[PDB]
């Protein structure tokens, strides 16, 4: 099985929406120890985002049922519901750790000093998945991963500001996710609103730095930024 066979399998899996296959295929690609292309990077990210997302959805549904079942007072139920939520939870964690291992030992690791774009991408991912862990963790567990997510987002932010156009989709993407981190995890709506607001204004101020390759991505992400600001400026008035 060649590398191209794997990337192709990953493309097929995505179309079949069998994302478990997709990640596994992109993981094997990553484990070939060679750098990832833009597309390969995209596939890897998309694959693992959907896997972690699927688990997350199911985790929220069961965790929601674990709230009802306990409030009711039933005992036999709380046992199985809790145990099932922990099963899903352990799957979600194992997935994130799976991505994080790839980022720490392959992608970020083998990045040269001149590859800022990739380093920001991978550092943003690192932040994303540590963030996904934070959502299902508590106490020392949560604080620690919330810390790792912070460190990652922060490092990526530093690089992006120093090496990327404010309109670069990767920098905008970082801003979006980082701001979300602030709002949802840090519970810091001001910082969240600020980062997003700043990022959006910076891109506009240099709205001329757009390029053919990714003007669509940029504008779209800029729109997502404004959306969040709108979605936050309402919750912060109720």
């Amino acid at each position: 099985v060649d590398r191209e066979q794997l990337v192709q399998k990953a493309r097929l899996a995505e179309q079949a929406e069998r994302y478990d296959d997709m990640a596994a295929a992109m993981k094997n690609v990553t484990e070939l120890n060679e750098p990832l292309s833009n597309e390969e990077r995209n596939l890897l990210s998309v694959a693992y985002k959907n896997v972690v997302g699927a688990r997350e959805s199911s985790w929220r549904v069961i965790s929601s049922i674990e709230q009802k079942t306990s409030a009711d007072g039933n005992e036999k139920k709380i046992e199985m519901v809790r145990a099932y939520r922990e099963k899903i939870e352990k799957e979600l964690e194992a997935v994130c750790q799976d991505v994080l291992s790839l980022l720490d030992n392959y992608l970020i690791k083998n990045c040269s000093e001149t590859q800022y774009e990739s380093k920001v991408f991978y550092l943003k991912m690192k932040g994303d998945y540590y963030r996904y862990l934070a959502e299902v963790a508590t106490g020392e567990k949560r604080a620690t991963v919330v810390e790792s997510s912070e460190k990652a987002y922060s490092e990526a932010h530093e690089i992006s500001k120093e090496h990327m156009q404010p309109t670069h989709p990767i920098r905008l993407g970082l801003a979006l996710n980082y701001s979300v981190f602030y709002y949802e995890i840090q519970n810091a709506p001001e910082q969240a609103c600020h980062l997003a607001k700043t990022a959006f204004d910076d891109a506009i101020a240099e709205l001329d730095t757009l390029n053919e390759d990714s003007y669509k991505d940029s504008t779209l992400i800029m729109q997502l930024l404004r959306d969040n600001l709108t979605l936050w400026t309402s919750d912060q008035q109720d």
């Binding site: 990077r41 995209n42 990210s45 701001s179 997502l224």
Partner: peptide, 11 residues
């Protein structure tokens, strides 16, 4: 209410 999001690199 989830804050909207996006992480899909430049292909």
């Amino acid at each position: 209410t989830p804050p909207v999001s996006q992480a899909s690199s430049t292909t």
